Amino acid sequence: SALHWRAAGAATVLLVIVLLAGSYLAVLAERGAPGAQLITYPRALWWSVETATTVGYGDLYPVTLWGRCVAVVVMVAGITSFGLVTAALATWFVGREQERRGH
Amino acid sequence: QVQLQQPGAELVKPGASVKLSCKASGYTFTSDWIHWVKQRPGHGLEWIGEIIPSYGRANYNEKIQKKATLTADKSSSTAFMQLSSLTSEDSAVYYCARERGDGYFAVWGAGTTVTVSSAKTTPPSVYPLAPGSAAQTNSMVTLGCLVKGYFPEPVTVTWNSGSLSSGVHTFPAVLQSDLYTLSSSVTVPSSSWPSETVTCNVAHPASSTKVDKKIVPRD
Amino acid sequence: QVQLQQPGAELVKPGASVKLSCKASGYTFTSDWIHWVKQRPGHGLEWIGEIIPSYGRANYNEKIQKKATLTADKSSSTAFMQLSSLTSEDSAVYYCARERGDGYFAVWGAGTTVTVSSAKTTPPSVYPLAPGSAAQTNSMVTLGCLVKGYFPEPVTVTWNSGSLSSGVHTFPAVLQSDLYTLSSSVTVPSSSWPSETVTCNVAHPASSTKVDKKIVPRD
Amino acid sequence: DILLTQSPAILSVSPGERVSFSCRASQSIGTDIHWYQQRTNGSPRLLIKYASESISGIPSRFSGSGSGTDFTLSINSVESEDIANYYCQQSNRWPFTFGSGTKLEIKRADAAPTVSIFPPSSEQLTSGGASVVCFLNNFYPKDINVKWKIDGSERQNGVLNSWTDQDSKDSTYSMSSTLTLTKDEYERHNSYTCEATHKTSTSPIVKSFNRN
């Protein structure tokens, strides 16, 4: 099993860990901030997914410094993760294209 | 099971502080928040604050004078609320409740009656109330017991250690010269008393006292 | 076509239940939702609920006592509404309508009159109403027929199996000793009757009865 | 902070009738409204969550509807055990907030009080005190007067009255009237009587005893 597939697998596991830790820590950052909506675990988890995929729905977002710090890590993990799957598919196609010219 | 166990009462001198306890059982998650809610007599529910025991962070109602400090003991599954420098404004029932981080109080403690007063704790006197000799009986009969000269609130009255629940009234205490008085009433089929026994049980949490009193006919 | 076919009436004893049917025709999509709407006499439209026949999922109005259960038969293109434990609150016209999943009721059924009552179904008696001998005729003449002692509602009156529509009044029923009565009126040029025939047709869905009555001059 | 308005404060209904409690939020909170029941001397109990979701343990009789700002808790066919204060609570925005509460009150048939007089107890006399207790039990409506007479003369000193809230067993009310004297004041009168004036009788209901 090639590096690029191990890495994509790793990045998926690591992103799901980031989405759960992020759920938990967003609620922990945002409770105590009057007006905050990112304060129960289930919608925190939905929030973490729409943040990682950079969907920017705009139904939920953090209003505190530590919530926003948590948000930044989730976004970076999401963009890296999905970038790494792209790199992995590039490698696969470059390989399949070497072979298809008998290199 | 009882998910949340709180002490029935605390008496506190004006100016003094008190730590309320809340010992949790059933399922505990990392996600669990313990909340505290204040209810003054004849008034509604007031959210005081929250703590997450797994991390130990606490948030408080901004809109009210901060009286409280929340701590928890991870090992003994107990949350504490330190109310400090109390006055008669702070006399109330304080509930603890458990929230799974999903927004609603699944389960509440039975609540701690906190009374701020300079007066001494006093256990109640319990007195039987059996009818007079000349009173005619219906198919039913009414018995009671008189719980007087106790402080502070509350008391819990039960009949036949809790097995008698149908036909029971407990009147709200009246307060007279820094001592409370109430009475409770029980109705049973006239045939069933006194051949079947009838006992009032009177717990006074503040004095750690519980007394029974059998109701027998007047001699 | 008629896109949605509902039975004209159902009588239901208080406490009893009833299944209303709604047989669809024209185009059917996977996307199609069938809705039910309640209208009490002299009142407005009340959304009861929806089902998607292709998947069989149903949603209901939360704001009202759940009386209904929606099912559909994919094969017979029929949606059903089981209303259970009815009372006189539930007496009403229930419409079914079809929505293409784009938000508006393109087409409605003719509606089922549901009456909750302990009274027996009774077909109507139909009586002619031809003028008396002494009545003078204008260029027009007025004829009618009297539909009395039926239960429950409704009846449908038509003239000349529906070919006569201009000059027709049907009065709302009045209710007297658990039986309804109404009358309907028809005006035709005085020349055209009786040389051209005039027949009232009286359908009573609840009793599966339809009767004709020719209006002829009094002998 | 979100304000929850519960109007009206009191809701009267007849037995078996449908009842709706309103909760209005000061801004949209989707379906993040939860409903609690608190009976007399009892702790709150969750009835409905997220505006409409059943809790196991709760009679099917209870339901919830609404979204945004306007929320309704409903009971189809009320009964005596429903007598309580009902609160709403939001979890959309920090901090969580409660509605001011709505009391349910049932209008049942008029019922005359069952009256019981108790002479003071020997145990009480032993401590130089004497309380004469009168129970006016299971009556409706809740308006009622109690009169004390000693030896046929009316008495007002040393009398303390307590009324219960509407009973969650039968929708009735009850009241205690307790005449307190010293052993001595009690020892120098014969007859103690408790007289109850209620809507259900033009005549008082009277109970007496003689210390003899």
Domains of chain D in sequence order: 4-106 (2.60.40.10), 114-210 (2.60.40.10)
The yes/no answer on whether domain A1-103 falls in CATH 1.10.287.70 is yes
Q: Is D92's Cβ below 8 Å from some Cβ in A?
A: yes
> What is the rounded CA–CA span in Å between residue B10 and residue B82?
12
CA of residue A9 relative to chain centroid, distance = 13
Lookup result for tokens 């069989």: C56
Contact D43 B129 (CB under 8 A): no
> Taking CB atoms and an 8 Å cutoff, what residues of chain D touch B146?
118, 121, 124, 131, 133, 178
Name the D residues in 17-46 with CB < 8 Å from any A CB: none
Q: What is the dihedral of CA D115, D120, D124, D129, to 10 degrees?
A: 110
Query: Is there a contact between D155 and D124 (Cβ–Cβ < 8 Å)?
Result: no
Nearest to D92 among A30, A32, A37 (CB): A37
* Residue of D177, D20, D5, D168 whose CA lies nearest to D83: D168
Name the C residues in 49-78 with CB < 8 Å from any D CB: 62-63, 65-66
> What is the rounded CA–CA span in Å between residue B126 and residue B175?
16
Tell the burial category of C22 from Cβ atoms under 10 Å away from its Cβ (0-12, 13-18, 19+).
buried
Nearest to A42 among B30, B55, B102 (CB): B102
Tokens of B106: 């699944």
Contact B183 D116 (CB under 8 A): no
Query: Is there a contact between B47 and D95 (Cβ–Cβ < 8 Å)?
Result: yes
Tokens of D182: 């010293």
* Residue of B59, B50, B58 whose CA lies nearest to B99: B50
> What is the rounded CA–CA span in Å between residue B69 and residue B80?
8
Tokens of A72: 């930044």
Q: What is the largest CA-CA distance in chain C?
A: 68
b/e for C188-211, b at 16 or more Cβ within 10 A? beeeebeeeebbbbbbbbbbebee
Tokens of D128: 């130089």
Query: Is there a contact between B35 and B47 (Cβ–Cβ < 8 Å)?
Result: yes
Angstrom CA distances, B34 to B39, B107, B127, D95, stand at 17, 10, 41, 14
> Taking CB atoms and an 8 Å cutoff, what residues of chain D touch A30?
94
> Taking CB atoms and an 8 Å cutoff, what residues of chain A touch B103?
40
Which residue in D has a C-alpha nearest to residue C63's C-alpha?
D65
Tell the burial category of A41 from Cβ atoms under 10 Å away from its Cβ (0-12, 13-18, 19+).
middle
Kindly report the nearest CA distance between residue B7 and chain A, in angstroms.
Answer: 28
> Taking CB atoms and an 8 Å cutoff, what residues of chain B touch A34?
62
Which CATH code, of 3.30.70.520, 2.30.30.30, 2.60.40.10, 1.10.10.10, is assigned to C125-214? 2.60.40.10
Residues of chain B with CATH 2.60.40.10: 4-116, 125-214
> What is the rounded CA–CA span in Å between residue D13 and residue D108?
9
Give D159-212 as a DSSP string. Answer: EEEEEPPPPTTTS-EEEEEEEEEEHHHHHT--EEEEEEE-TT-SSPEEEEEE--
Give A9-57 as a DSSP string. Answer: HHHHHHHHHHHHHHHHHHHHHHTTSTT----SHHHHHHHHHHHHTT---
Q: What letter represents residue C189's amino acid? A: P
Give C171-216 as a DSSP string. Answer: PPPEE-SS-EEEEEEEEEEGGGTTTS--EEEEEEGGGTEEEEEE--
Cis peptide before C194 (omega within 30 of 0): yes
Bridge partners of residue B157, in order along the sequence? B202
Q: Beta strands D4-5 and D19-25: pairing type?
A: antiparallel
Which residue in B has a C-alpha nearest to residue D46's C-alpha?
B106
Residue B195 makes CB contacts below 8 A (sequence gap 6+) with: none
Q: What is the dihedral of CA B24, B28, B32, B38, to 10 degrees?
A: -10
Element (H, E) at A89: helix A65-99
* Residue of C28, C5, C7, C6 whose CA lies nearest to C74: C28
Contact C62 D18 (CB under 8 A): no
**Cβ neighbours around A54 below 10 Å, total:** 11
Query: Is there a contact between B91 and B40 (Cβ–Cβ < 8 Å)?
Result: yes
Contact A36 D93 (CB under 8 A): yes
> What is the rounded CA–CA span in Å between residue A13 and residue A7?
10
| Residue D30 zone, left/alpha/beta (φ > 0; ψ -120 to 50; rest) | left
Half-sphere exposure of C133 (CA within 13 A, CB side): 2
Do C and A make contact via 3 or more CB pairs under 8 A? The reply is: no
C105: DSSP letter: E
Contact C63 D65 (CB under 8 A): yes
Angstrom CA distances, D87 to A31, B50, D52, D100, stand at 22, 19, 15, 7
> Taking CB atoms and an 8 Å cutoff, what residues of chain D touch A26?
none
φ and ψ at residue A52, rounded to 5 degrees: -60, -40
Which CATH code, of 2.30.42.10, 2.40.160.10, 2.60.40.1180, 2.60.40.10, is assigned to B4-116? 2.60.40.10
Chains touching C (3+ CB pairs < 8 Å): D
Return the residue in D50, D94, D97 with the most chain A beta carbons within 10 A, the one to mutate for interface testing.
D94
B122: DSSP letter: B
> Taking CB atoms and an 8 Å cutoff, what residues of chain B touch D87?
44-45
* Residue of B150, B157, B204 whose CA lies nearest to B176: B150
- Vertex C4: Cα angle to C1 and C6 (nearest 5): 125
Query: Is there a contact between A73 and A18 (Cβ–Cβ < 8 Å)?
Result: yes
Query: Is there a contact between D180 and D158 (Cβ–Cβ < 8 Å)?
Result: yes
Angstrom CA distances, B128 to A53, B144, B211, C23, D180, stand at 73, 6, 12, 74, 15
Which residue in B has a C-alpha nearest to residue D119's C-alpha?
B132
> Taking CB atoms and an 8 Å cutoff, what residues of chain B touch D127?
125
> What is the rounded CA–CA span in Å between residue C13 and residue D192?
59
SS3 state at B206: helix
> Taking CB atoms and an 8 Å cutoff, what residues of chain D touch A37?
92-93
> What is the rounded CA–CA span in Å between residue B142 and residue D111?
17
Q: Is B129's Cβ below 8 Å from some Cβ in D?
A: yes
Q: Is B66's Cβ below 8 Å from some Cβ in A?
A: no
Kindly report the nearest CA distance between residue B39 and chain A, in angstroms.
Answer: 22
Contact B59 A27 (CB under 8 A): no
Which residue in C has a C-alpha nearest to residue D20's C-alpha?
C63
Tokens of C210: 């339809």
Angstrom CA distances, B86 to B11, B16, B118, stand at 11, 6, 12
What Å resolution does this PDB entry report? 2.4
Q: Is A24's Cβ below 8 Å from some Cβ in B?
A: yes
Chains touching B (3+ CB pairs < 8 Å): A, D
* Residue of C111, C113, C96 whose CA lies nearest to C33: C96
Q: Beta strands C92-99 and C78-83: pairing type?
A: unpaired
Kindly report the nearest CA distance between residue A40 and chain B, in angstroms.
Answer: 5
Q: How many CB pairs under 8 A join A and D?
A: 18
> Taking CB atoms and an 8 Å cutoff, what residues of chain A touch D29?
none
Angstrom CA distances, B176 to B156, D119, D129, stand at 19, 21, 15
Query: Is there a contact between B123 and B150 (Cβ–Cβ < 8 Å)?
Result: yes
SS3 state at B95: strand
> Taking CB atoms and an 8 Å cutoff, what residues of chain D touch C62?
52, 63-66
> Taking CB atoms and an 8 Å cutoff, what residues of chain B touch D172?
none
Return the residue in B185, B188, B218 with the most chain D beta carbons within 10 A, the one to mutate for interface testing.
B185
Query: Is there a contact between C40 and C28 (Cβ–Cβ < 8 Å)?
Result: no
> What is the rounded CA–CA span in Å between residue B15 and residue C31?
69
Q: Beta strands D159-163 and D173-182: pairing type?
A: antiparallel
Query: Is there a contact between D4 and D24 (Cβ–Cβ < 8 Å)?
Result: yes
Packing angle of the helix pair A65-99, A41-52 (nearest 10 deg) = 50
Tokens of D69: 């700002």
Dump strand ranges (E) for chain D.
4-5, 10-13, 19-25, 33-38, 45-49, 53-54, 62-67, 70-75, 85-90, 97-98, 102-106, 114-118, 129-139, 145-150, 153-155, 159-163, 173-182, 191-197, 205-210
Contact B101 A34 (CB under 8 A): no
Q: Which residues have a C–N gap over 2.5 Å right after them in chain D? A: none
Half-sphere exposure of C93 (CA within 13 A, CB side): 15
Cis peptide before B128 (omega within 30 of 0): no
Contact A36 D1 (CB under 8 A): no
Dump strand ranges (E) for C18-173.
18-24, 33-39, 46-52, 57-60, 68-73, 78-83, 92-99, 105-108, 112-116, 125-129, 140-150, 156-159, 168-170
* Residue of B135, B196, B145 whose CA lies nearest to D116: B135
Q: Is A40's Cβ below 8 Å from some Cβ in D?
A: yes
Query: Is there a contact between C95 and C111 (Cβ–Cβ < 8 Å)?
Result: yes
End-to-end CA distance of chain A: 21
Q: What letter represents residue C135's amino acid? A: A
Q: What letter represents residue B15's amino acid? A: G
> What is the rounded CA–CA span in Å between residue D79 and residue B17?
43
> What is the rounded CA–CA span in Å between residue C65 and residue C47?
12
> What is the rounded CA–CA span in Å between residue C145 and residue C170?
10
Nearest to B109 among D43, D116, D169 (CB): D43
